Design a protein around this nucleic acid. Structure first.
Ligand SMILES: [Ca+2]
Length: 100
DNA sequence: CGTACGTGCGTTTAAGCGGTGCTAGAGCTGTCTACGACCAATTGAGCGGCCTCGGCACCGGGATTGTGAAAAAAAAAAGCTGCA
């Protein structure tokens, strides 16, 4: 083998895979398709975060809470997508708090 | 070529003005603490490296689809005959 480790490069791909095997267990994903799924996750991270950042800033608050994320989500996603995304985020917070 | 629009009348209507009267609720001050930054030790999830092996890229060949020309079936539209 050869010396010097290539420098770390973060991605979401192991989590895209994991979600992929829930939804379509007998289905894989190409190299460039994963590059797209990455570019997607990063896009929506940025959009949501930015809007929450602004919401917090408008109402004179230092802290982004799950509340901000929800409001941003309601502003950014279309109708049905927002509902489900609001449900799942709520579920996730509810579940996380009670498992402390 | 047909009539949907623009024009210019009168007729009707409620927008706007100025004023008064109430109070929801914006928006502030002060007190308290739960909740997040911070740190340090801990230590597994996630990384880069690497090796298999089955899906996809590609090929050839046959089956199917689809276009288009020119040749039928049919419809149609005029000229010809008789016609109560
Ligand atoms: Ca890997």
């Amino acid at each position: 083998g050869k010396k010097r480790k290539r420098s770390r490069k973060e991605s979401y791909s192991i989590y895209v895979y994991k979600v992929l095997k829930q939804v379509h267990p007998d289905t894989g994903i190409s190299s460039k398709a994963m590059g797209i799924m990455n570019s997607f996750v990063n896009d929506i991270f940025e959009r949501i975060a930015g809007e929450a950042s602004r919401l917090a800033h408008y109402n004179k608050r230092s802290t982004i809470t799950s509340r901000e994320i929800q409001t941003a989500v309601r502003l950014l996603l279309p109708g049905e997508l927002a509902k489900h995304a609001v449900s799942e985020g709520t579920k996730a917070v509810t579940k996380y708090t009670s498992a402390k």
